[PDB]
From Swiss-Prot, chain A:
One of its GO terms (molecular function) is structural constituent of ribosome. N-terminally acetylated by acetyltransferase NatA. Component of the large ribosomal subunit (LSU). Mature yeast ribosomes consist of a small (40S) and a large (60S) subunit. The 40S small subunit contains 1 molecule of ribosomal RNA (18S rRNA) and 33 different proteins (encoded by 57 genes). The large 60S subunit contains 3 rRNA molecules (25S, 5.8S and 5S rRNA) and 46 different proteins (encoded by 81 genes). Belongs to the eukaryotic ribosomal protein eL14 family. Present with 45300 molecules/cell in log phase SD medium. The lineage of its organism: Eukaryota, Fungi, Dikarya, Ascomycota, Saccharomycotina. This is Large ribosomal subunit protein eL14A. Pfam families: KOW, Ribosomal_L14e. It is found in: Cytoplasm. Keywords: Acetylation, Cytoplasm, Ribonucleoprotein, Ribosomal protein. It comes from Saccharomyces cerevisiae (strain ATCC 204508 / S288c). Its main location: cytoplasm. InterPro entries: KOW, Rib_uL2_dom2, Ribosomal_eL14, Ribosomal_eL14_dom, Translation_prot_SH3-like_sf. One of its GO terms (cellular component) is cytosolic large ribosomal subunit.
From Swiss-Prot, chain C:
The gene is RPL3. Disruption phenotype: A mutant confers resistance to trichodermin, a trichotecene toxin produced by plant-pathogenic fungi. This is Large ribosomal subunit protein uL3. Keywords: Cytoplasm, Isopeptide bond, Methylation, Phosphoprotein, Ribonucleoprotein, Ribosomal protein, Ubl conjugation. Present with 450 molecules/cell in log phase SD medium. It comes from Saccharomyces cerevisiae (strain ATCC 204508 / S288c). The chain holds residues 2 to 291 of 387 of the full protein.
From Swiss-Prot, chain D:
Belongs to the eukaryotic ribosomal protein eL20 family. The gene is RPL20A. Component of the ribosome, a large ribonucleoprotein complex responsible for the synthesis of proteins in the cell. The small ribosomal subunit (SSU) binds messenger RNAs (mRNAs) and translates the encoded message by selecting cognate aminoacyl-transfer RNA (tRNA) molecules. The large subunit (LSU) contains the ribosomal catalytic site termed the peptidyl transferase center (PTC), which catalyzes the formation of peptide bonds, thereby polymerizing the amino acids delivered by tRNAs into a polypeptide chain. Its main location: cytoplasm. This is Large ribosomal subunit protein eL20A.
UniProtKB/Swiss-Prot annotation, chain E:
InterPro entries: Ribosomal_uL13, Ribosomal_uL13_CS, Ribosomal_uL13_euk/arc, Ribosomal_uL13_sf. N-terminally acetylated by acetyltransferase NatA. Pfam families: Ribosomal_L13 (PF00572). Component of the ribosome, a large ribonucleoprotein complex responsible for the synthesis of proteins in the cell. The small ribosomal subunit (SSU) binds messenger RNAs (mRNAs) and translates the encoded message by selecting cognate aminoacyl-transfer RNA (tRNA) molecules. The large subunit (LSU) contains the ribosomal catalytic site termed the peptidyl transferase center (PTC), which catalyzes the formation of peptide bonds, thereby polymerizing the amino acids delivered by tRNAs into a polypeptide chain. It comes from Saccharomyces cerevisiae (strain ATCC 204508 / S288c). This is Large ribosomal subunit protein uL13A. The gene is RPL16A.
RNA sequence: UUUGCUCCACACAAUAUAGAUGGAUACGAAUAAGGCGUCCUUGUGGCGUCGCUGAACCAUAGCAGGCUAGCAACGGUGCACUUGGCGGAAAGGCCUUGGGUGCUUGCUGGCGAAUUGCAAUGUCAUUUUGCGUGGGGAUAAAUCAUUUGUAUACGACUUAGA
RNA sequence: CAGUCAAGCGUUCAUAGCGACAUUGCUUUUUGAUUCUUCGAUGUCGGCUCUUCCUAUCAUACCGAAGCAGAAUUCGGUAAG
RNA sequence: AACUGGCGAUGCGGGAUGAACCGAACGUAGAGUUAAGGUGCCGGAAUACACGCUCAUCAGACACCACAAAAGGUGUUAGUU
């Protein structure tokens, strides 16, 4: 019998780990971790996404599930080449995490008219779905 | 439908004060949903009304009002400074206030 | 400065205040711990202190100088006619203690127990439990509901009993009503036993037996306002003391600038609730015999 | 403020017998130019018979980090005054700039030895990017090939006083 | 700003929670706090036990019935923590304290209602991992609280009744998901997706 | 210092299988089961090759890394427990009064009873643990054996035999009487 | 002891709201871990997927929400009722099977609103009272004084007394 | 009233117990020093009586040490119940 | 005793509290900035940001100021040879 151990593998910070900048000038952009500086700071770059290469605390970004093969210490030019070929920008967009951010922003931009359009559509959808439960 | 609010929910927190001296002529007001000074700038200059009831009907109403305005922000946490036509009684610390959407800019 | 010579304090600081007890009947503050293994039984009983006498018995103490020798002992004779089980009380355990959920009473209550519900019994209409007793006398209309409310709740059950004061020579003629906790069996049997024994008397020979250490809860003999000399046992001041010698000389230092709670003061003596422990049942005697 | 690396070139005042004095230069980390020129006279008063009144500052310039986005190993040699005496230490720290390592250095010196800026002299800030020149194990551990670690027990900041579900510290 | 905010004290630090609640009560927010026994204090049990023994020492010397009243229940210890953060001797302070209720476990009016947490006061967010901490129930028992065992049985009861409701809740919600799956591919749902929903 | 990573490797024998939920380890072998609640160190467990388990501490201080080795060491003891068991043998040392040790079963609780320790009338009772078995070996007198899966219980029992037999009010350099553990080995070492 | 008292429902009510203005919207445990879905070993596993805040979710249109009229629906919601239960920690509230009764903005119409004059909270949710209204409901005690001595300075207490 | 150092004592061993030459303190249960308060007055010595507090523990609980082989001591710890 | 600044003769903000300390000296009001001091709650103001260090079975927590020392501790951290 195999020595069962709960796998418990989770989001290690490493060169090439893509992160989301949650506070600052970027505030919601992607940037690959370029080179580890310390336990709590690291060099990051977001050239395709739009983040300048900089030192930053790990508490100023949130790590993401995704990463790609990026050699340590690569400048903005090599990072953008590996970022494009990996489609890490696209994979982030297709992820559920980004869809909630996009849904959040799209809902916030809704005008008063568009909010009223939501209200009618939500009543319509509720009518059919509530009917659907009742029959089965 | 059942909701008919056009104002914002607000709390009368206290007079402007130091540790031991207070200035009743200025009231500190919390705005619901405002936690930063930047969001409080939207409400600057907006009319405020403390609405209260009295047992004696005065001019066809048992509801009396004191009016005021949001003059500036206070602190780092979205509280604002407010002055009223008559200063608030100070038994209304923690009481509810209504911040209206006028005078409007949007 | 320190007292010149040490001495123990006069009196017990755990029997405070020395005040009149709230009632003449001393209640059981703590009933025995419940054992679910043992059968249902009463844990207390009510009787009346009649007086004292003297007895002779042979001492059995293998190692004493009076071993197998006769001794004379002072004894207390407690007049104990049987108690009438009338009513039960259920107690659900809460994070605020035991709370009485309900009290279920018996079909019929005698004049003695109903006298406890009046201060002027003679000029009254004797309207006590009359409309309550209309709830009885059916199969389960309202009878069993209270019982089952106690069964599914009420982790502690205590029967209500009263003394047959009319059987004693006292002129009181008004019964003493008190709770007695059942501490045997399960909860249901406690409610069942209470139900079966409702309105019928419980004899002392079914609760306490010979050679058994029991406790007695009573209110001590009252003595009124007492000076410190006999209330607390303090030393009498010398004969030549100006303006009184049955006193405490110094009732406190300059500081704290107050009289302390611990200093002996004149006050009420006697008439206190007391729970004395470890009294041996030398004899349980019947009244229907010479 | 943010430490800036200043170059300060000064000299003793030119007299008649000695025109063109010897033009000493220092690299001193300071908040601003006023503190830069002040720190210059403090040290130049320590190494030469000259004070501010008897000399002049001929050039004050900012030195920028050559590449502010490459992380390097900085060898820092420092002397400082504790309550009892004076001690020279060699510390070292990762950074991307000379200045932010010096900002780091003053933070560490304050934290570990209670040394205020008044008490610290920065003897020499040296950069090395070649390993085996790195002596401190608290820096060597970030140089292992293929470094990767988690950030366990992630505590997420809350904007509102109340939340409606127990937090998760997963990452 | 809710009419009443009900917080469960489980896994919360007594001081920080008392600070947050006291500010809310002063600003006019009625608050009730439940699970007072599962509240936390930083420091080992011996530390916080000694501190309450130090508090127990203090009593009026000439009459102990007027001195500090050392309440042993975990709810009253939190209440003491909060009352120290309120100007309780003024009329405004009495009003703020009235707006607060503290309980051990969850009494009936609140185990059907929502419970929130205060991330500022949560132990798993505040204390550095590995740091010893004290649970309020154990501390209160040690200094003379009598109802830890009673609450545990009544909390076990409430939880097991609360487990059935959630399994019922999961039963009711899955019928929506599978019925909505058949009422899916609707133009209304597509239109809402384009409009942020 | 806050070392970024430290690891220790456990090596499980071919017949033992370790189960590790959140911080509960369940070592099962021929001699049965052994469990441990270990929720007070904040460690991690990793499976490698069905014969290797790696226990790691991330960003640990000095005290944290020290507790990592203990957690490793405890798990060998359970692995050693089911594979071999832990056997402790004591010896009753006495100058004048023989020490009378037997095993009593009151309500089937299996107490250790010691009589006549320095001729005193006080009778020492030591409850045994569940998972340790009392044995009185022949081929050598004045010796008590007890084997068990958990080293913790067998050694705590053994200490409890020592504890009740401390000599009071006397120079204990001279009055050496007692029951001292002499062997701490395995039941089936190299067998 | 000149119609007293109780429950409930209405036409009118007070020292007033420590402060309404859509909704306090229920797992538990862990946090060096969990939630949900699914598969399978007469059982504490495998495979998916979510989190990274409630910026959510319900409820949300109509004279503060009117008068009405139709449709491819057999739903949803309020109310006077009804049948079964559940809930004692402070339960005093939760689920209910049946009928009636409205509404329904799920979709489509007709009519109304205006002058509160360019804002004025522009007034929409109870405690208690009357020789109040009317549908019910079972018609007591304490205290003084007298008395007692298990009590007692006086009060207080323990008793008795048609 | 405690501590640090340890030359020495302790039979051939500093430290079981002590401990010089030095030196660091603590306390306000001594007495000085001072004159702040009180001279339109705070009743002063001692004893008696009575309560509480402190611990720098004489006794009683448990224990560590010894120049503790038993008895008796001595040193120390938690401890003012 | 010296020089100066103060209190006496002086409120006000701060040091909880206080003649003298810090800030600032005062007609009656209004608005805006500040000083010293602060910003978890009492209490106005960041449960802010950043790096470390510390776990105390008497932690520490802000000048005057309401005290602590010598001597020690593979407790922990950094540094020197």
């Amino acid at each position: 019998t195999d020595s069962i151990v709960k796998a418990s593998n989770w989001r290690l910070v490493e060169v090439g780990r893509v992160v989301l900048i949650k506070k600052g000038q970027s505030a919601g952009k992607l940037a690959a971790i370029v080179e580890i500086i310390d336990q709590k700071k690291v060099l990051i770059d977001g050239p395709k996404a739009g983040v300048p290469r900089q030192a930053i605390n790990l508490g100023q970004v949130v790590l993401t599930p995704l990463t790609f093969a990026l050699p340590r210490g690569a400048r903005t030019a090599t990072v953008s080449k590996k970022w494009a070929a990996a489609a890490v920008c696209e994979k982030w967009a297709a992820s559920s995490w980004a869809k909630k951010i996009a849904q959040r922003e799209r809902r916030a931009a809704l005008t008063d008219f568009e909010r009223f359009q939501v209200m009618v559509l939500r009543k319509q959808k509720r009518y059919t779905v509530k009917k659907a439960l009742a029959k089965a | 439908a059942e909701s008919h609010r056009l104002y914002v929910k607000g709390k009368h927190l206290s007079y402007q004060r130091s540790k031991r001296v207070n200035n009743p002529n200025v009231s500190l007001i919390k705005i619901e949903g405002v936690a930063t000074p930047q969001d409080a700038q939207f409400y600057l200059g907006k009319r405020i009304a403390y609405v209260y009831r009295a047992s004696k009907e005065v001019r066809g109403s048992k509801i009396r009002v004191m009016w005021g305005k949001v003059t500036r922000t206070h602190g780092n946490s979205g509280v604002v400074r407010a002055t009223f036509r008559n200063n608030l009684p100070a038994k209304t610390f923690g009481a509810s206030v209504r911040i209206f959407l006028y005078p409007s800019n949007i | 400065s320190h007292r010149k010579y040490e001495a123990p304090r006069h009196g017990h600081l755990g029997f405070l205040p020395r005040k009149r007890a709230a009632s003449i009947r001393a209640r059981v503050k703590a009933f025995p711990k419940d054992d679910r293994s043992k059968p249902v039984a009463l844990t207390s009983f009510l009787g009346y202190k009649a007086g004292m006498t003297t007895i002779v018995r042979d001492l059995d103490r293998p190692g004493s100088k009076f071993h197998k020798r006769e001794v004379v002992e002072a004894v207390t004779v407690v007049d104990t006619p049987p108690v009438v089980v009338v009513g039960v009380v259920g107690y659900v355990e809460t994070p605020r203690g035991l709370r009485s959920l309900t009290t279920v009473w018996a079909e019929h209550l005698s004049d003695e127990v109903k006298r406890r519900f009046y201060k002027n019994w003679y000029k009254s209409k004797k309207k006590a439990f009359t409309k309550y007793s209309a709830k009885y006398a059916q199969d389960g209309a309202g009878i069993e509901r209270e019982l089952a409310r106690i069964k599914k709740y009420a982790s502690v059950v205590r029967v209500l009993v009263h003394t047959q004061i009319r059987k004693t020579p006292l002129a009181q003629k008004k019964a003493h009503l008190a709770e007695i906790q059942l501490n045997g069996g399960s909860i249901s049997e406690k409610v069942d036993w209470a139900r079966e024994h409702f309105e019928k008397t419980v004899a002392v020979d079914s609760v306490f037996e010979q050679n058994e250490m029991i406790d007695a809860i009573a209110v001590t003999k009252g003595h009124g306002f007492e000076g410190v000399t006999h209330r607390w046992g303090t030393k009498k001041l010398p004969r030549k003391t100006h303006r009184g010698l049955r006193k405490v000389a110094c009732i406190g230092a300059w500081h704290p600038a107050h009289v302390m709670w611990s200093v002996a003061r004149a006050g009420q003596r006697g008439y206190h609730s007391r729970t004395s422990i470890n009294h041996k049942i030398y004899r349980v005697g019947k009244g229907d015999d010479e | 403020a943010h430490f800036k690396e200043y170059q300060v070139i000064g000299r003793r005042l030119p007299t008649e017998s000695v025109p063109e004095p010897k033009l000493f230069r220092m690299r001193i980390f300071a908040s601003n130019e006023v503190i830069a020129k002040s720190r210059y006279w403090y040290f130049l008063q320590k190494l030469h018979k000259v004070k501010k009144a008897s000399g002049e500052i001929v050039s004050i310039n900012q030195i920028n980090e050559a590449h502010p986005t490459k992380v390097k190993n900085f060898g820092v040699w420092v002397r400082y005054d504790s309550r009892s005496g004076t001690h020279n230490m060699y510390k070292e720290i990762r950074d991307v700039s000379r200045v932010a390592a010096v900002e780091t250095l003053y933070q560490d010196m304050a934290a570990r030895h209670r040394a205020r800026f008044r008490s610290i002299h920065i003897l020499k800030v040296a950069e090395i990017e070649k390993t085996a020149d790195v002596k401190r194990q608290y820096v060597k551990q970030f140089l292992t090939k293929d470094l990767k670690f988690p950030l366990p027990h992630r505590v997420q900041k809350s904007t509102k006083t109340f939340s409606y579900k127990r937090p998760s510290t997963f990452y | 700003v809710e009419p009443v905010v009900v917080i469960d004290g489980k896994g919360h630090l007594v001081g920080r929670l008392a600070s947050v609640v006291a500010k809310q009560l002063l600003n006019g927010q009625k608050i009730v706090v439940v699970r007072a026994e599962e509240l936390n204090i930083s420091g080992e049990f011996f530390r916080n036990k000694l501190k309450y023994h130090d508090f127990l020492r203090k009593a009026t010397a000439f009459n102990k019935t007027r001195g500090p009243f050392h309440f042993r229940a975990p709810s009253r210890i939190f209440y003491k923590a909060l009352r120290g953060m309120v100007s309780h001797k003024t009329a405004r302070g009495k009003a703020a304290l009235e707006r607060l209720k503290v309980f051990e476990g969850i009494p009936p009016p609140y185990d059907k209602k929502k419970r929130v947490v205060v991330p500022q006061a949560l132990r798993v967010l505040r204390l550095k991992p590995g740091r010893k901490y004290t649970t309020l129930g154990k501390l209160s028992t040690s200094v003379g609280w009598k109802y830890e065992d009673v609450v545990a049985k009544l909390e076990a009861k409430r939880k097991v009744s609360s487990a059935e409701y959630y399994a019922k809740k999961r039963a009711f919600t899955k019928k929506v998901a599978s019925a909505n799956a058949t009422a899916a591919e609707s133009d209304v749902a597509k239109q809402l997706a384009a409009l942020g929903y | 210092m806050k070392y970024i990573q430290t690891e220790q490797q456990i090596e499980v024998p071919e017949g033992v299988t370790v189960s590790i939920k959140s911080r509960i380890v369940k070592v099962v072998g021929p001699r049965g089961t052994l469990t441990k609640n270990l929720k007070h160190i904040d460690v991690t467990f990793t499976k490698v090759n069905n014969q290797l388990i790696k226990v790691a501490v991330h960003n640990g201080g000095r005290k944290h890394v020290a507790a990592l080795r203990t957690v490793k060491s405890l798990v060998d003891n359970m692995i050693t427990g089911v594979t071999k068991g832990y056997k402790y043998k004591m010896r009753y040392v006495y100058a004048h009064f023989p020490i009378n040790v037997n095993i009593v079963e009151k309500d089937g609780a299996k107490f250790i009873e010691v009589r006549n320790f320095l001729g005193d009338k006080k009778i020492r009772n030591v409850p045994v643990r569940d998972g340790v078995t009392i044995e009185f070996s022949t081929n050598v007198k004045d010796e008590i054996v007890l084997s068990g899966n958990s080293v913790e219980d067998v050694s705590q029992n053994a200490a409890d035999l020592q504890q009740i037999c401390r000599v009071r009010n006397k120079d204990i350099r001279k009055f050496l009487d007692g029951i001292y553990v002499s062997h701490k080995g395995f039941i089936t070492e190299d067998l």
